[PDB]
Amino acid sequence: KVLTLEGDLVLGGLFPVHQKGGPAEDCGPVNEHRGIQRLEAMLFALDRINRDPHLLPGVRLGAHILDSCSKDTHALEQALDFVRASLSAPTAITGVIGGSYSDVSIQVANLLRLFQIPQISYASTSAKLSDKSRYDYFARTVPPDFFQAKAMAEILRFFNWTYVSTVASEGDYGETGIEAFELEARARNICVATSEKVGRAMSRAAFEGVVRALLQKPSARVAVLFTRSEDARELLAASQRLNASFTWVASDGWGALESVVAGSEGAAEGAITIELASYPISDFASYFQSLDPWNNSRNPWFREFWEQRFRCSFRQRDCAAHSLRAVPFEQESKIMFVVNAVYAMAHALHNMHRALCPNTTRLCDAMRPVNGRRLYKDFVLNVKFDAPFRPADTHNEVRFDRFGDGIGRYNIFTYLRAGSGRYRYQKVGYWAEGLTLDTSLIPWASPSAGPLPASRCSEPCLQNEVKSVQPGEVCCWLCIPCQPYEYRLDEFTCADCGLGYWPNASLTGCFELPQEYIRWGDAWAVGPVTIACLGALATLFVLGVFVRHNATPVVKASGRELCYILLGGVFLCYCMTFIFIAKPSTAVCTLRRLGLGTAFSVCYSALLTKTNRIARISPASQVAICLALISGQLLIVVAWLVVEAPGTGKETAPERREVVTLRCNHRDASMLGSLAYNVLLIALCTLYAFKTRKCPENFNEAKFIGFTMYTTCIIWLAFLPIFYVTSSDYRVQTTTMCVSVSLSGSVVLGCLFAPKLHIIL
Amino acid sequence: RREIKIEGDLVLGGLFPINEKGTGTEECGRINEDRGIQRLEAMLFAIDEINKDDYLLPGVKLGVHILDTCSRDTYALEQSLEFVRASLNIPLLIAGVIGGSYSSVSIQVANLLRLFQIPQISYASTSAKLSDKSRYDYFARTVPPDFYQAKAMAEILRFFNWTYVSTVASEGDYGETGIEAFEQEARLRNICIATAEKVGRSNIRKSYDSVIRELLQKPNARVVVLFMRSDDSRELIAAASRANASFTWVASDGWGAQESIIKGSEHVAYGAITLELASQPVRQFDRYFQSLNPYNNHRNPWFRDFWEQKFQCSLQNKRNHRRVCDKHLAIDSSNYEQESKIMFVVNAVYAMAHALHKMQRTLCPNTTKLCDAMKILDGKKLYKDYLLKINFTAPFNPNKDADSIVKFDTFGDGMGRYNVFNFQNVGGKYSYLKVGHWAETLSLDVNSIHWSRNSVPTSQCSDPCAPNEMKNMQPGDVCCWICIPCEPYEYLADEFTCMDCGSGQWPTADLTGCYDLPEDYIRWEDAWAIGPVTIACLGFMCTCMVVTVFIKHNNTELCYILLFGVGLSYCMTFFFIAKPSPVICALRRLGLGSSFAICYSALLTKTNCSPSSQVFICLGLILVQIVMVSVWLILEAPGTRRYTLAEKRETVILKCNVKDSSMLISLTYDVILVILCTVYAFKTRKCPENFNEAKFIGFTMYTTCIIWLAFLPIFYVTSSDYRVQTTTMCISVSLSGFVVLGCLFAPKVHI
Ligand SMILES: N[C@](CC1c2ccccc2Oc2ccccc21)(C(=O)O)[C@H]1C[C@@H]1C(=O)O
Ligand SMILES: N[C@](CC1c2ccccc2Oc2ccccc21)(C(=O)O)[C@H]1C[C@@H]1C(=O)O
Ligand SMILES: *[C@@H]1O[C@H](CO)[C@@H](O)[C@H](O)[C@H]1NC(C)=O
Ligand SMILES: *[C@@H]1O[C@H](CO)[C@@H](O)[C@H](O)[C@H]1NC(C)=O
C-alpha cells in the first residue's frame, strides 16, 4: 500500500500506521492514534498549503507517504523507494516528513544522509539524533529528551533542592536523560546521593528493593524520575505499599497520564511532573470528523482503520450508519508537531524558490534538480515563521537550532487533591526559555505550609561554629564547632591567628587584644600611694628639722651640702616610686625609671662623698667628682634611650591579652648598665666605709655611715635575686621594683632620722 | 553500464576503479590499467583457483558480481545499491563485497552496506576512520591502516635515539590523521615534536621554500619526519635541493621506494629512511595475466577498452587516426609489472572464501553442498564470528615463510608489515635498499645503513652536561633543558637541582659528597707567631728566675702567690691550641681569669697595710665563681662558626662557642672592680713603706689599669680567627705579667 499524490514537488512520509505485530503477521494491527491521525494531519496540512496563496502560490506540493510498520528494517526497505526515486515513473522526493520512533528515524537518517535528502521528524525525541557528525540531514520540530533534564534541574534549583535521590530506567529513554541531568546538576551545585536503574524485565520484589534503597538515605525527599509509563506505576505501587511520601520530579514519561497513578492515590500526591506543551488544532478536529470510507479514497489504510475501530465487516453489510462525529474524538498530542514539520518544509521550499526562481512563481528550471545540502543548510535551518493554526492570543514560534532540534516548551504539572472533587492534575507553570512557576498554586509542595527540604547538610553555624569540612563532598560541607581560640577570618576554616586575644564581631581583625593599660584599682593602688605619702611626709619633716638646725655649731662640723644632696635624692626617688604607678607612654614610664636610676646614683654618690671626708680625716673636689659621675650616668642612660631603647610588650599565645606597657618593656637591658654601675658604686662605698670609721668625729657619724653601708648593701643584695626572678612576670616586676625603691629610700630616711632627733633634742 | 555476472551458489560483490576519475560531461573516462583492470583480473583468478580447489568449498560454486566505481564516490554509492536490492535483471544474493580501493569510496560503501548487514572486505583502503567500528561495524580490510607506519617511525626514532625531531605533513585526511597519530604516539616514547607544520595543495614553490627556511631555523633537529604524499614529497625535496641544505628524512609509504620522488635531487635525499608496505609478488598471477587476449576473455567487458587504450590500437570500426590492432600481440614482461596489492586482493577473496567454508562446515556437518538456512546469510554472524576469526596461511606463497598469515584484529584491520628502506649510494649508483622490517617489533640492519655525511645523526636538544657543575632544570618541557651552574658548596640531586646538607661540609666527586671538614686552627709552632712566642718565653724565664731567687732567700710566700699567678698566666699562651676539647678551653679561661684576679688582688694587702688569710679567702671566692659556670649547662662541646655568608672553605671549632663570650665579660667585670679598688686605695695610702715602694706600687697599678683598658676593646672587636684570638690574649697576658713582675722585682733587684 502506497499513498501517492500529484504535484510539482513531492514530499515523503513515514508513519507507524501498523504496529510491530511480531513473527505471526507481516505488520499487524492498525495504529489509530500514531499512524492514522498523524497521516491525516499531514494530508490536511498539505491541502491547506496547496490552498494557501501566500505559501508556494504556483508550486503544488505532492505526497509520497509510506508505512514503516513500527520496524527499522521495514523503514529502510520503504525508504529505498525514496532513494531510488531521485537516484534514477518514480517521483522526485525533495524531503521526507516522517519518523515517529527513534530507531526508525535513526535508520532513515542513516540511509538518506548518503543521498542528500532532508528529513524533518515530528515525534522523534532522542539525543543520538542530535549528533550532526552521523546525522547531518535530520531535523525535528520536537525538543530532544535531554531538555526536560534541564527543566527539572532548574525546578530543583528554584526550590533549593540539592540532595536528590534520582531513579533512572533501562533502555534508551532514561539511559541518556539521567546522564544529561547529572551533567546539568553539577552546574547548579546539585549532588546525587543514590541512583537506581529500573529495568523493563523486573520483579515486584526488585521494585520494593529499589524503594527501600531510597529509604537508605533518610534526608532525600525528592526523587527525579526518568522511568517510562509502565516503569513508574510499579514504583508508585511499591511506594504506596511501603508507605513513603517521596515527592517526585518526573519527566514526560509520567506527564499527566491517568493510567500511571490510578490505584496508588495518596503516595504520589504533590509530585511535580512535566509534559510537552501542545495546543489542539481547531480545524484538524473538523477535518477528521468528516471522513468516510466512501469519499476518502486517497488513504489506502482508512479501510482497515474503519474495519478495526468500528467492529464490523465490509464484505457483508454490517456497518453503514457509523460516523466519526458521534464518536468522541481526541487529538493526538503530537499533531501540531506534524503540521509544524510539514509547514516548515513548505516554508523552506518557498524560500528556496524565491531565492532561486525570481522570474515567475512557477518552478523554474534552476530549482528542478532540488539539492538536499543547500536546502537543509540555508533554508530548512533558517525558518522563522509563525506556527500555523495557533491560538489567537498565544504566540508560538517555529524555528530550529544549530543542531536542527526544536524549541523547548514544557508544561509544569502538579498532582493536586481537590477538596470536593477527586485527584486531578493542574498546570502550575511552563518552561520555554526560562523557568516560570506559579508558586501560589501548589497545595502540597506549598510555601505557605513550608516547602519540602532536601539538602541533608544543615547549616547551624553562623560565625563561630563554621568549619566547612567534607570527607569527599563538594555540594555541601559540614561545620564542626572549633575552640574560641581561633578566629573566623576565612569562611572556610577556623583561622587560629591567636589563642589569647578574642576576635571582634567581624572576626577579621587578628591583632592585639583591644583593652586599656590599667592595673591599679583599689586593692593595692592606695597602699603604694600611702607608703609614698608617708615617705614624703618623713622627708618633709627631716627637711624642716635640718632647716631649724641649719644655723648651729653641730651642723657646722658636718657637710650640709652632702645632707642636702642626700635629701634631694631621697625626694626624687620617692617621687619616682609614687609616679611609677601610672599609665605608660613614651615620655612617662621611661623618664620615671631613668629618674629613679639617677636618684639611686645620686644617693650612692652622696654616701661616697659623706664617707670619703671621714676616711681622709679640697672638699669641693669630692662634690665636683660626684656631680661629674652623676652627669655621666645620666648621659649614659639618655644615650641608651636614644640608641637602643625599643619597647613593646604583649602576650598573645596563651590565654592572654596585650601587656600593659607602652615603652618600658625592654628596660631590663637598659637598666642592666645602670644596675651594674650602681652595684660597683655601692661596693666601692662599702669598702671605703669599712676602711674608714676609725676617727670618732661629728658625734660618731661614722656609726651612721656604717649603718647605711650595712643596710643599703644588704637590701640591694636581697632584692637583686628577687628583681631578677620577678622580671619574668610583668605584674610582679612593677610592684617589687616600687617596693625596693621605697625600701631603699626608707633605709636612708631611718638612718638620717637620728641626727634629726639629736637636733630636735 | 557494464558488469561481470557469474552464476553460482554464493555470489561475491566487487568494486574496482576500472575507469579513472574524469571531469566535465563524462563522469569517468580513461581505463585504469594498474588499479582497476589488474586487481579485477586478480580477483577473477583467485575465484577461479578457489573453484578449482577441492579443500575449499568443494560442492559450493562461488559466483561473482563485479561493478565499476569510476574512481568516484557518488558513482560507487549509486552502484552499491544493486548489492542490497537482492535481499528485498534478476538480482543475485550477495554474500559479501570484495571492493573498495579509495578511502572515501570504501567509507560510503560501508555506510550503505552496514544498514543491510552485508560484510565488506577492502584491499587498498588504509584510512584510519574505517577502524571506527561504531560507524563501520561490517567493514574489514587485509591492509593495515595508515597509523601503523606512524608507530613504526616512532619506534625507529626511539631505537636511533632521535628525541628532537621536526615533523612536516601534508593537507588532507591522510597527512592530518597521520601527524595526529604520530604526535599522540611519540609522547609515549619521550619523543618531542619541534616546528610541527604542514604543506598545502597550493602547488607554489614559495611556500615550500618558506617551509625549508623554517626547518633550517632549528639546528638541533637534524632528522625530519615526513608523512606527506608523493607530489608534496617531491616538491619538498626540490625545495631542499634549492639553497642546498642537509637533513635526515624519515618518510612514510607516500615516499616509499618510488624513484619519482627523486629526480635531479639525489643528494639532499641521501640517507633517507623510508617505509614501504611489504608485498610479496604473486608468481601464479603472472602466467594468468600475461596469457589474456580479447579473443577468449569474454567475461570482462572492460578488457577490450583496456587493450585498445594500452596498445593505442583499434579492433572494430578502426579509423585512419589509430592503427588496427595487430595479431600475436600479448602482454609480456617487457611492458607489464605487478600491482603492489594483488596479494592483498587475493587475501581478501580467500578470507571471504574461508569464512564461507567455515560457516558451511559449522552449520551443517557431513555434507558438501549448500544446506537449509544458508539460502539467506546473516551478515552479523558471517562477519563477527566466521570472518573476524580466521587463521590461514596466505595462498600462493613462493616459499611459505610462515610469517604471511591472513588474520583480522578486533577492529577488522590487517597485520602491519612494513619494509624499512634506505636511499644510499653504492659504486656511484643511487638506489634504495631494504635495511629492516617491522611486523610487530622493529628489526633493522644497522650495518648496511648509509646515513647523511658519514656518521649517525644526533638530532638531540639539550646535550647532557656535568651534574656537579651545572644543575639539570627543565624550564617549560622535558624536551630541552638549560645547563645552569649551581652553588659550589652543595651536592647534586638525581636530576632536579643542587641542595646543601648544612654548614661545615663541602661536596666532593661523589654525588652526595658533602662531608664535615676536618679542619682546625693554625699551628703556631713554626708559623707567624714568633715575636709573641719569644716574649712569652722570656716572661716565663724571668718568672722562673724570680721564683728561684725568692725561694733561695729564707725570710731576709706572699710574693710566691703573686708569682704563681704569673706562672698561671704564662700557661694561658701554651693552653691555646688547635686541638679540639670541650673542657680544656673552659679550664684555660677559668685559670686565666683566676690568675688575673689574684694578681690584681695581691696589691690589696700592701695598700691596706690575719690579712693573709682574708686575701686567700677572697681569692677563693673568684675561683668559686669560675667553677660555678661549670655547674650549669653553659659549657658545651666546641662548634664551628656559622660563617655561611662568608666564602670560607673550612671552619675551625676551637673557641668552644660558649666559653669565651661569657668568660671574657666576667673577667672584664672582675678586673674593672679590682682595678677601681686598687686605684682608690693607692692614692689614699700615705706611703706605708719605703719611698720607692709606694711609687712602684702606684706605677704597677697604673700600668695594670692601662693594659686592661687597652685590651678591653680588642676582646670585643677580636673577630675571632685562628690568629687574632690567641695573639690578643697572649699580648694582654704578657703585658699583665710584665707590669707586676717589673715593679715587683726592679726595686728588689736594685737593693
Ligand atoms: N518521542 C519518542 C520518545 C520515546 C519515549 C517517550 C516516553 C517513554 C519512553 C520512550 O521510549 C523512547 C526511547 C528512546 C528515545 C525516545 C523514546 C520517540 O520515539 O523518539 C516517542 C514518543 C514518540 C512516539 O513514538 O510517538
Ligand atoms: N591505501 C590508500 C592510502 C592513500 C594514500 C597513500 C599515500 C599517499 C596518499 C594517499 O591518499 C590517502 C588519503 C587518505 C587515506 C588513504 C590514502 C587508500 O586509498 O586508502 C591508497 C594506496 C591505496 C589506493 O588508492 O590504491
Ligand atoms: C532559595 O534560597 C534563596 C537564597 O539562597 C532564597 O532567596 C529563596 O527564597 C529560596 N527559595 C525558596 C525557599 O523557595
Ligand atoms: C640509544 O641509547 C641507549 C642508551 O645508552 C643505548 O643503549 C643504545 O645503544 C643507543 N642506540 C643507538 C646509539 O643507536
Short mmCIF file of C-alpha atoms in Angstrom, two decimals, chain A residues 73 76-77 80 83-84 87 107 110-111 113-116 131 133-134, chain B residues 77-78 81 84-85 88 108 111-117 132 134-135:
data_model
loop_
_atom_site.label_atom_id
_atom_site.label_comp_id
_atom_site.label_asym_id
_atom_site.label_seq_id
_atom_site.Cartn_x
_atom_site.Cartn_y
_atom_site.Cartn_z
CA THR A 73 14.17 -2.88 8.67
CA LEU A 76 14.82 1.04 5.48
CA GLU A 77 13.09 -1.08 2.83
CA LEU A 80 14.73 2.56 -0.51
CA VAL A 83 16.29 6.68 -2.56
CA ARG A 84 15.61 5.05 -5.94
CA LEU A 87 18.69 8.47 -7.72
CA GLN A 107 17.84 4.18 10.31
CA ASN A 110 21.48 6.98 8.12
CA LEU A 111 20.10 5.82 4.76
CA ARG A 113 22.37 11.12 4.59
CA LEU A 114 24.29 9.41 1.77
CA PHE A 115 21.83 10.56 -0.92
CA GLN A 116 21.42 14.15 0.37
CA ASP A 131 24.90 14.24 16.54
CA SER A 133 28.58 14.03 12.51
CA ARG A 134 26.34 10.99 11.93
CA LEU B 77 27.48 4.81 -3.82
CA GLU B 78 24.85 4.60 -6.56
CA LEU B 81 22.53 -0.38 -4.47
CA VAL B 84 21.46 -4.58 -1.42
CA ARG B 85 18.42 -4.75 -3.73
CA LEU B 88 14.43 -7.31 -0.60
CA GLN B 108 30.43 5.45 1.75
CA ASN B 111 27.98 3.29 5.37
CA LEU B 112 25.40 1.99 2.89
CA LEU B 113 26.14 -1.71 3.48
CA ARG B 114 26.07 -1.65 7.30
CA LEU B 115 22.33 -0.95 7.21
CA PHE B 116 21.60 -4.11 5.18
CA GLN B 117 24.06 -6.36 7.08
CA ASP B 132 35.84 3.04 13.98
CA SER B 134 30.80 2.31 15.97
CA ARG B 135 30.32 3.78 12.48
#
